[PDB]
Design a protein around this ligand. Structure first.
Ligand code: HEM
Ligand code: HEM
Ligand code: TUE
Ligand code: TUE
Ligand code: H4B
Ligand code: H4B
Ligand code: ZN
Lengths: 407, 411
């Protein structure tokens, strides 16, 4: 019930008490670990509201205060009447920052308290949403000096009036299926690029076409909007040693801005809550470029380096992978766009873990996601035992809108 | 209950019914996942259900479930337990048990080979000298002049836990570690504690960087004894790089035979506390972990210097770059000397096929993702994208405490 975690490279042992506050379920049982599975009303409402409000007022040294009790009273009265309730601005900000703080799969949580929260709860239309989103993008991008931000659209009411951003990220390249049988652009987005076309989009059918936004307000049909090109900061990808690298014609966008998740605070459900930080190099270099069901460029890069691709034991894929990742970092840095390498970020996370254990009693962490997709054991997180559990407020997964939307 | 797993690179979805035959606990609960935690005397009372369950499995596998041979064997074991508080396995049972323990080892990427395992029955052994002889033969047989063969040597089962056979080495072949008065470590830092024990027990240490450790063997619960593996039996490989000629000057070598000796084999409730087993190396065990862990030989810097990588900023990925070259050199060296080894791409690829085969033929394959995924280049191997269900089946290999922490000294 009081758990210890060991770092095996350093023998440091932390004691986790925070997990006893965990509420939601992991998917695992005593008979089975699902640690590597991708996705494992008024009486419902008030305890949830109460538990959140309890942690809020404790966090501001006002637990058991008149202001505390008043707010509990007040929210309880609002729930009784409206069947929902509204967060005070302060609570909204705490809630958001804490959803990040609790995101067990996030290696960048050391930055969690420095999140810019944009209250977009007065929004009523997709045009409105578009405006809020352009502002988020410009603010977050900041001419390459990235700043973390989240924009929070109105909370779910009766599930018929949901706000949803249909894109999985605010910025992402298109994916088209060729008669050739292959795939042009980003294969991860083939279906979404289709639904854009189905709903009107004029695709330039290229390899790196920034997708249009597909915005859904109040449960209405979603609408297309093109982000101002001048707001989409992109980095051309070159290598600091191989001049042929530029000829591969690769680029990536500076702003990772996840738009498809669900923010839960005090039982309230924010279906449209796009948030953004900045890239860890491997997200692009390892996953986006080298995953087989993505840009899958490994073969071509290797061939250009003239490595022995005959036997896998030449570790040519490994060599190419390293070089590709060197280039991603080199390009971003040269263009003064914020980026962190997998060594710095994992080392930062270890310090953060130690802070959370020391100041909060622990830190929920999903090893399967925290360890970078390359060079795993030469990063400190590899040797770090982690406890995974679900705290609230949280970011949750939610079904893709097209499978849901009552057209 | 049926459980599905998905490969997110291929969209293959498999169905697990095998987890239903799971008993032992995972460490996990509905409120906490302990999936990345490294480590999360038995009465006649608890012994017969364990025996029966095993014997039920064994006889299914040979398509004799419910036959008279099956029933009589259950009878015989039943009686033998109430009479002797334990029982003995038939040779067939031991062999089946050993293979299935490997097959059930959820952290082993090498399980495609599970059915081909040479079982050495050392249950007639009584003394440490007898142990040394058995081990020597294991080493010679498994080595096979570089053409490695999986083998396991099974010494006598636990009785009262007061007469245990134990191999005090974590591996049959492993390099000495020496702490120096200045804080630095000479040799393998992983073995400083065991090295010290050996030294105290009479071992004359050469005090070099790659001294092969002596066998420290415990028979029947008596104090352990030192034995030197004949050098001619210890196959080693000098490490060089195919393009880099300075690499040989790094003075590196490794032993060819990975032979794990500190685990406990459990079969039908019976506990085998000394069951050394051996296969062959996946290149990353040496090249990534043994050479490059900060707490091991830790050669990344020295290799990086020699490569003249930009080492001032970690965003140069000089570490990643040096790691790859070392792993290249490890594979090249072994292949050049015709010592069996497998790269992490081949091994993970084989594991996916094995695992699929296991779902089809067996209804599942327990697998520990945290361990299965290679410690370099994780996502460019197919296992990274594979969902896995982890659970514990018997027969199994279990951890046990280091014998020096539990041994009662005779003098
Ligand atoms: C500022 C620098 C940040 C860095 C370097 C970073 C890093 C990462 C990385 C590498 C992942 C793995 C994701 C993948 O492989 O697809 C991840 C996941 C995640 N991040 Fe962070 N992140 C940052 C900011 C943020 C912010 C601002 C938020 C929310 C306010 C956030 C919330 C999350 C969540 C919820 C996940 C897991 C999502 C899932 O379960 O699929 N991160 N992060
Ligand atoms: C024949 C070629 C084999 C290969 C390539 C192989 C590969 C591996 C690797 C790379 C590991 C992870 C090691 C680590 O990181 O510490 C492992 C773990 C393991 N292997 Fe295999 N193995 C082989 C044969 C065997 C055999 C013959 C047995 C037993 C009869 C076995 C049983 C196990 C067990 C029980 C573990 C888990 C160790 C633990 O929990 O600490 N393997 N294997
Ligand atoms: C697509 N992979 C699974 C998945 C599903 N749904 C959302 C996901 O987002 C990952 C994610 C989330 C937030 C991030 C913030 C910053 C950053 N650099 N990467 C980040 C990556 C990932
Ligand atoms: C010390 N490291 C953890 C550890 C503890 N106790 C036993 C271990 O065994 C690892 C292991 C076990 C069996 C193997 C068989 C073949 C192989 N190539 N590596 C293998 C590696 C590992
Ligand atoms: C099957 C496995 O759970 C899946 O591939 C996970 C593994 N770890 C990951 N880790 C990160 N950071 N991102 C991912 O998308 C994944 N995918
Ligand atoms: C904390 C963590 O469980 C520990 O470092 C694990 C990670 N995965 C591993 N995987 C393998 N194959 N071998 C190991 O020793 C480890 N160590
Ligand atoms: Zn688990």
């Amino acid at each position: 019930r009081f758990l210890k975690v060991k770092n095996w490279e350093t023998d440091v042992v932390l004691t986790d008490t925070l997990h006893l506050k965990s509420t939601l379920e992991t998917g695992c049982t005593e008979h089975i670990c699902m640690g590597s599975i991708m996705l494992p009303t008024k009486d419902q409402l008030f305890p949830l509201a109460k538990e959140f409000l309890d942690q809020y007022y404790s966090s501001i040294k006002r637990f058991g205060s008149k202001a505390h009790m008043d707010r509990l009273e007040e929210v309880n009265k609002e729930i009784e009447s409206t069947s929902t309730y509204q967060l005070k601005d302060t609570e909204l900000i705490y809630g958001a920052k804490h959803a990040w703080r609790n995101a067990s799969r996030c290696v960048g949580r050391i930055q969690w308290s420095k999140l810019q929260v944009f209250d977009a709860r007065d929004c009523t239309t997709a045009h409105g949403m578009f405006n809020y989103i352009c502002n988020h993008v410009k603010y977050a991008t900041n001419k390459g000096n990235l700043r973390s931000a989240i924009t929070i659209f109105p909370q779910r009411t009766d599930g018929k009036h949901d706000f949803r951003v249909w894109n999985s990220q605010l910025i992402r390249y298109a994916g088209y299926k060729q008669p050739d049988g292959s795939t042009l652009g980003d294969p991860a987005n083939v279906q979404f690029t289709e639904i854009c076309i189905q709903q009107g989009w004029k695709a330039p059918r290229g390899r790196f076409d920034v997708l249009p936004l597909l915005l859904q307000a109040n449960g209405n049909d979603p609408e297309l909007f093109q982000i101002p090109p001048e707001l989409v900061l992109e980095v051309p990808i070159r290598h600091p040693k191989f001049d042929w690298f530029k000829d591969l014609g690769l680029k990536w966008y500076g702003l990772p801005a996840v738009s498809n998740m669900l923010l839960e605070i005090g039982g309230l459900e924010f279906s449209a809550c796009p948030f953004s930080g900045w890239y860890m190099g491997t997200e692009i270099g390892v996953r986006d470029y080298c995953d087989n069901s993505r840009y899958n460029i490994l073969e071509e890069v290797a061939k250009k380096m003239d490595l022995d691709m005959r036997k896998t034991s030449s570790l040519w894929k490994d060599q190419a992978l390293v070089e590709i990742n060197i280039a991603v970092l080199y390009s971003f840095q040269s263009d003064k766009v914020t980026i962190v390498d997998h060594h710095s970020a994992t080392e930062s996370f270890i310090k953060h873990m130690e802070n959370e254990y020391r100041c909060r009693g622990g830190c929920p962490a999903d090893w399967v996601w925290i360890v970078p997709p390359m060079s795993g054991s030469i990063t400190p997180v590899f040797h770090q035992e982690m406890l995974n559990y679900r705290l609230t407020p949280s970011f949750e997964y939610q079904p893709d809108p097209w499978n849901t939307h009552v057209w």
